[PDB]
């Protein structure tokens, strides 16, 4: 049961590292995207 | 011994019904029970005149509690003496009912009793103007039970500091 949250935390790390990179990129070019 | 919880069906139905057509009227079944069983005993203090003012202030959301980083001590009380209960304790919080009449000193025990009631009204109000969307009825119910549990304990002199 505890091996699922350890691997599920490595997944979150990966998703979040992705969101950071892409958001950084989006601002370096077309920040218009991040508007509500 | 294990710690469990089961909703009292009588209480559950009373609430689930009130949520569907929420009112702040003191005389409805839902609030009346809580008024008599929880609120009234909680807001019962030595100086009963000021106490009844606080009860009205709480219902109006006009009551406020500040910590303390020209008046006198007969009405307001002071740092070493609580205004609500005649007790002598270090008072680290002070109450304001206005529109402030005066700033009144409060013992930690009083603060716990009053906030417990203010928390109840606060959540109830959130529902009346709800404002409570993503929480299902079972969760909300058990929130009210929690809110009451706090008042039930403060009622009896069990508080947190």
């Amino acid at each position: 049961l505890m091996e699922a949250i350890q691997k599920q935390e490595e997944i979150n790390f990966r998703l979040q590292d992705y969101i950071d990179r892409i958001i950084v990129a989006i601002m370096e070019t077309n920040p218009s995207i991040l508007e509500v | 011994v294990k710690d469990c919880k089961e909703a009292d069906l009588s209480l559950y139905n009373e609430f689930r019904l009130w949520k569907d057509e929420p009112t702040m009227d003191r005389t409805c079944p839902f609030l009346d029970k809580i008024y008599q069983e929880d609120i009234f005993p909680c807001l019962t203090f030595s100086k009963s005149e000021l106490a009844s003012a606080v009860l009205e202030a709480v219902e109006n959301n006009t009551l406020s509690i500040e910590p303390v980083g020209k008046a006198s001590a007969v009405e307001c009380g002071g740092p070493k003496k609580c205004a609500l209960t005649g007790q002598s304790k270090s008072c680290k919080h002070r109450i304001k009912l206005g529109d402030s009449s005066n700033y009144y000193y409060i013992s930690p025990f009083c603060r716990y009793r009053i906030t417990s009631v203010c928390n109840f009204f606060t959540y109830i109000r959130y529902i009346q103007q709800g404002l409570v969307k993503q929480q299902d009825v079972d969760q909300m119910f058990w929130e009210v039970m929690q809110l009451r549990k706090e008042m039930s304990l403060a009622k009896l002199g069990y508080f947190k500091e």
Partner: protein, 176 residues
């Protein structure tokens, strides 16, 4: 369609997680509040235009996750910010304590001359107040920050908060 604006000011929201940044944003920009609002993922901004000294100001309010240490995506966040709303929770003293740490990031990663306003939010919780107004206003005055208490929930001073920081930015940008 007249969408014109005379000045475009970027203002960033900073402060401890849960002080209500995202709701200050929604309250000002779309007059909406969410009691159940969740933690902010990624980075966003919404815009609103106002009149200041006859000139129209288009405000660009940026918001991001209140949890910040290792983000490194912060350089981009503060870049071009001419104003900052530094937010704490009146009812959680810890969030006021960390205001100093936030001033650090501003003095490190953000431009100087950036207008900084201290905002005490959740003024609507009257019985829970942990940070007396005077102590904050004092800290604000000595540290060169504006100060106001807002409630995203009942709307008090939210409008006022933005009108204030936006006009202080006007005066500095028009003068130089």
């Amino acid at each position: 369609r007249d969408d014109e604006y005379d000045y475009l000011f970027k203002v960033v929201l900073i402060g401890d997680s849960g002080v209500g940044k995202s709701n200050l944003l929604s309250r000002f920009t779309r007059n909406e509040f969410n009691l159940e609002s969740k933690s902010t993922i990624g980075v966003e901004f919404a815009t609103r235009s106002i009149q200041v000294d006859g000139k129209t100001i288009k405000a660009q309010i940026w918001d991001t996750a209140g949890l910040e240490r290792y983000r490194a995506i912060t350089s981009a966040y503060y870049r071009g910010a001419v104003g900052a709303l530094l937010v704490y929770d009146i009812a959680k003293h810890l969030t006021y304590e960390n205001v100093e740490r936030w001033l650090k990031e501003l003095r490190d990663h953000a431009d100087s001359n950036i207008v900084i306003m201290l905002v005490g939010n959740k003024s609507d919780l009257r019985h829970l107040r942990a940070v007396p107004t005077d102590e904050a206003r004092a800290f604000a005055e000595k540290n060169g920050l504006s100060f106001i208490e807002t409630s995203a929930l009942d709307s008090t001073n939210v409008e006022a908060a933005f009108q204030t920081i936006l006009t202080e930015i006007y005066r500095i940008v028009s003068q130089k």
